[PDB]
């Protein structure tokens, strides 16, 4: 379901072997997290460098395509999907259970219930039972906010 939408859309980042993060091509903009490093696949992205923003722990740029996931400035709380499980938006927090996560879960996108990406996760909190996550979101004016879950641990 979500895998079909993210098929040839989420690009693994090779850390000399295994993967450390996923890059997301959305809205004509490439996306990749700073805090985890490695080798991006699909060398049409590797040939171009991506201008940085360390305050959002991220770096962005343009897209060499002859890939256009839309923006959601408004997210009803409800529940949304991501390719490890379901998430709920609780007045400023995104929620996942105990065991889901792990190191290397950074850079994953979270979509809405039908396909539009709403945010991208870069880490989480150390607790569980639908605990908060280190996520980069967009407000009603299309402005970037790094939501702080008081976790400081980037899964």
């Amino acid at each position: 379901m979500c895998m079909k939408l993210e098929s040839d859309k989420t690009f693994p980042i090779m850390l000399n072997g295994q993967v450390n993060g996923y890059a997301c091509v959305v809205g004509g903009r490439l996306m990749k997290p700073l805090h985890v490093e490695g080798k991006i696949d699909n060398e049409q992205l590797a040939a171009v460098k991506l201008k940085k923003a360390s305050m959002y722990d991220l770096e962005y740029g343009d897209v060499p395509q002859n890939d256009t996931l839309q923006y959601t400035s408004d997210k009803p709380p409800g529940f949304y999907n991501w390719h490890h499980g379901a998430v709920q938006y609780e007045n400023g927090r995104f929620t996942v259970p105990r065991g889901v996560g792990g190191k290397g879960d950074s850079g994953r996108p979270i979509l809405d219930n039908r396909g539009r990406v709403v945010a991208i996760v870069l880490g989480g909190a150390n607790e569980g039972t639908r605990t908060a996550l280190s996520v980069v979101t967009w407000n009603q004016k299309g402005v970037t906010i790094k939501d702080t879950p008081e976790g400081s641990e980037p899964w």
């Binding site: 809205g27 903009r29 923003a53 305050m55 959002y56 962005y60 923006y71 967009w138 299309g142 402005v143 970037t144």
Partner: protein
Amino acid sequence: EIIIHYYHRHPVYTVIVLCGVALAILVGTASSAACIAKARRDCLTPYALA
């Protein structure tokens, strides 16, 4: 005329004070340019993501 007059009176003091003035204005201009560039980056890093 002031520059050449002070250079003729005191050579080393005049050359070091104009060297300090040139270095100070160069460092000030470079630092303020870097400050303006960093402020521009921190201001327009949200809006370039839509």
